[PDB]
Design a protein around this ligand. Structure first.
Ligand SMILES: *Cc1ccc(S(=O)(=O)N2CCNc3ccccc32)cc1
Ligand SMILES: *Cc1ccc(S(=O)(=O)N2CCNc3ccccc32)cc1
Lengths: 9, 236, 236, 9
């Protein structure tokens, strides 16, 4: 399952 | 440590450059150096620490899963023996992943969590603690495996308790914590019903609070709500 | 070296696993270990060496270009002074890139090129030599810069001379060499007309030989021909 | 300008 993604700051 | 001679502000500046350059191992090393200066981190600095390490460990986890799949295939009936290499290399990647998780956990324990008194900082770090124990649980098999899973659960639970008391139901950190703890329930703790219940209740309670938000806050909260809904769709 | 205790066959096996895992630094270290066993490389092993290092250096070059652009912007009129950090970090990435290029060049010189007698191996390694000197030229500024550019030119030229004598005009290595040497002319040597002429002649001579090829060979040759045409389209 | 790409082996 997908967890929280990590977009650029 | 190798960043001991560099100014805190310079380490933060270089972390931001490393992000732009997609140099996440460098980013993580700069942020580790910044934490080791001993001062508390601002909101922006906490996000840089998290981005750096999530990118590093994410790459390691993806590699580990590729190797573990190959290793699984090798142990099926009919498979030709190819020697110890796949296990050895999976083990190498696993040890490196464990090392990074231990490093992040070590920063949290020395001394980020103990100095974090505001809900936004404390919840953020306890969420991180749960996540990196969850990554350790994904690769665990030995005598301490139950303890690793329980350490992730305990961290997430403390984060949840504080977030429910101290943060609105739309707070992005609260939402992301709930998302990740639901994934823990589903993927690690063999508790799909708890996962589903947590995602549903979190979504519903956030929906009900959206009316209080600015346009900008709404965007961030609704993005994470959609991620909760995506998982609910997958799981049901 | 740290791979000295691992069997050659195991290093090759692990290089292939590392590729699947997208672990290109590991892949390169395994292939370096395999070259250092002292035996010549097969066609497949040459391709693994090349893939590993092109992925590593490609990531470093992309990072360097991002940092060099930021550094350039900083030196424009109107730009606020932000201290030495951007230059320092560009320099760090540059030094690491130079190190990797020097390592690859060192493998070629000790002793891959001198033992390569067949055209497919020798052209392949001289093409590599030209490419890694070209990457060094991209970041060079000092007293040896002209010499670095001339070292890339000399390697490419020797490769071209052998390929023209010994390989058909559709050979993928010959084609890729011509593509990269044309890029050298355009991007490094300030010779866009030579770049265009080489790409055109290479394309035309390959076209004329496609009739001799199997369906499978045709696919590979036409793919690289299209890359030559793409550059011609960009340059004209 | 693009140089020769590096597909998987
Ligand atoms: C754990 C957590 C939760 C939210 C945030 S954020 O700063 O709002 N942010 C960046 C990380 N990922 C993310 C996804 C969607 C929307 C916002 C974010 C940071 C960390
Ligand atoms: C330099 C060179 C030229 C061709 C080849 S290949 O093995 O035919 N190959 C893999 C590398 N890139 C590539 C692009 C298009 C078509 C084939 C290839 C290898 C190396």
């Amino acid at each position: 399952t997908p967890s929280l993604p990590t977009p650029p700051t | 440590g190798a960043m001991g001679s560099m100014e805190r502000a310079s380490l933060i500046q270089k972390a931001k450059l490393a992000e732009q350059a997609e140099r996440y191992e460098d980013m993580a090393a700069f942020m580790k150096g910044a934490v080791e200066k001993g001062e508390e981190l601002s909101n922006e600095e906490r996000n840089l620490l998290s981005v750096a390490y999530k990118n590093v460990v994410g790459g390691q986890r993806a590699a580990w899963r590729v190797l573990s799949s190959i290793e699984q295939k090798s142990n099926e009936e009919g498979s030709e023996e190819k020697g110890p290499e796949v296990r050895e290399y999976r083990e190498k990647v696993e040890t490196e992943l464990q090392g990074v998780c231990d490093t992040v956990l070590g920063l949290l324990d020395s001394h980020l969590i103990k100095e974090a008194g505001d809900a936004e900082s404390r919840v953020f770090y306890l969420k991180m603690k749960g996540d990196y124990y969850r990554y350790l649980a994904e690769v665990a098999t030995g005598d301490d495996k139950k303890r690793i899973i329980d350490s992730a659960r305990s961290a997430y639970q403390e984060a949840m308790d504080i977030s429910k008391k101290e943060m609105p139901p739309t707070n992005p950190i609260r939402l992301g914590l709930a998302l990740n703890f639901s994934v823990f329930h589903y993927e690690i703790a063999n508790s799909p019903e708890e996962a589903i219940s947590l995602a549903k209740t979190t979504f519903d309670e956030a929906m009900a609070d959206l009316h209080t938000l600015s346009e900008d806050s709404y965007k961030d909260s609704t993005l994470i709500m959609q991620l909760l809904r995506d998982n609910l769709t997958l799981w049901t």
